Amino acid sequence: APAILLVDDEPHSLAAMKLALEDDFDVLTAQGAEAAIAILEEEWVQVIICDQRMPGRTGVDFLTEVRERWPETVRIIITGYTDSASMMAAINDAGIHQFLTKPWHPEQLLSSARNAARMFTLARENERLSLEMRLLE
Amino acid sequence: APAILLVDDEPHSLAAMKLALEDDFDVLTAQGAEAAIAILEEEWVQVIICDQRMPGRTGVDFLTEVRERWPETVRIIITGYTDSASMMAAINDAGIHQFLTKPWHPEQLLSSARNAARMFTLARENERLSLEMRLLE
Ligand code: BEF
Ligand code: BEF
Ligand SMILES: [Mg+2]
Ligand SMILES: [Mg+2]
Ligand SMILES: [Mg+2]
Numbered sequence: 196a197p198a199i200l201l202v203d204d205e206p207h208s209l210a211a212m213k214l215a216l217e218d219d220f221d222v223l224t225a226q227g228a229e230a231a232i233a234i235l236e237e238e239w240v241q242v243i244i245c246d247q248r249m250p251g252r253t254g255v256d257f258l259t260e261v262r263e264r265w266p267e268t269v270r271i272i273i274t275g276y277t278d279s280a281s282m283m284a285a286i287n288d289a290g291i292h293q294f295l296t297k298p299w300h301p302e303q304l305l306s307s308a309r310n311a312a313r314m315f316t317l318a319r320e321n322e323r324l325s326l327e328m329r330l331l332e
Numbered sequence: 333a334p335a336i337l338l339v340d341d342e343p344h345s346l347a348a349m350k351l352a353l354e355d356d357f358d359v360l361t362a363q364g365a366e367a368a369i370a371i372l373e374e375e376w377v378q379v380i381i382c383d384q385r386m387p388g389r390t391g392v393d394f395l396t397e398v399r400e401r402w403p404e405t406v407r408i409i410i411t412g413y414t415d416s417a418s419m420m421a422a423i424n425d426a427g428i429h430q431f432l433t434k435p436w437h438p439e440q441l442l443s444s445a446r447n448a449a450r451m452f453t454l455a456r457e458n459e460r461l462s463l464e465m466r467l468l469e
């Protein structure tokens with residue numbers, strides 16, 4: 196089953212985000228870029244959420260690669276420093292579907308999640324149709 | 333072009349929500365259920381957002397019908413009274429994709445919007461494929 200990947204510098208927000216999502220998804224949790232890529236390798240992930248402000252590699256960077264190695268996956272950013280334009284510009288260059296502000300309702304953040312996974316589902320069958328309708332003409 | 337429908341009891345939040353979205357969508361605004369249905373008649377709408385707490389008819393009710401008369405349209409609820417279970421249950425029976433808490437970032441609420449419209453787009457071509465791949469077998 197498609198899980199959701201949680202990826203934040205502070206391990207107390209993975210803790211939280213899980214508490215909000217665990218009841219509905221298979222939550223996978225990671226402490227940063229290099230740590231997280233490791234997981235998308237072995238396990239299968241429908242949705243990912245990433246702190247932007249992370250030591251070393253930023254969410255936007257991580258996700259530029261995620262976009263490249265596993266394009267079937269819905270990418271989401273999350274920020275408490277929502278006031279910066281540089282960021283948004285960065286966000287707006289990458290293929291980032293949702294950007295959430297901190298903090299967040301257990302039921303809101305939960306929703307941006309159910310979204311992503313419904314979306315991941317559309318996109319994924321939206322492609323099936325194609326592939327299979329190619330194998331006709 | 334597909335617009336977005338805004339539908340809230342307090343005309344000062346339509347004011348706001350527009351200010352957040354106008355730069356990116358064709359915003360249509362309505363003061364409540366009966367008022368809003370009137371608009372989906374003449375004009376074409378890809379995304380709708382509805383206050384739950386509205387005199388007379390509630391968002392969830394409105395949207396149950398919207399779901400029925402214009403199913404191609406992405407439905408969204410928005411609440412400041414996020415603590416009620418009755419609601420969520422109601423929300424969870426209807427076909428409601430996103431539920432936002434008040435208040436909201438200009439760039440968050442903005443995003444739940446861009447979401448919806450990308451989604452409205454998937455769903456709508458996801459169907460094209462079908463219809464057209466039916467006209468083969
Ligand atoms: F700093 Be992260 F964006 F919360
Ligand atoms: F009362 Be609405 F939900 F803001
Ligand atoms: Mg629990
Ligand atoms: Mg941080
Ligand atoms: Mg403006």
Ligand SMILES: [Mg+2]
Nearest residue numbers: 341383385386
């Ligand atoms: Mg109200």
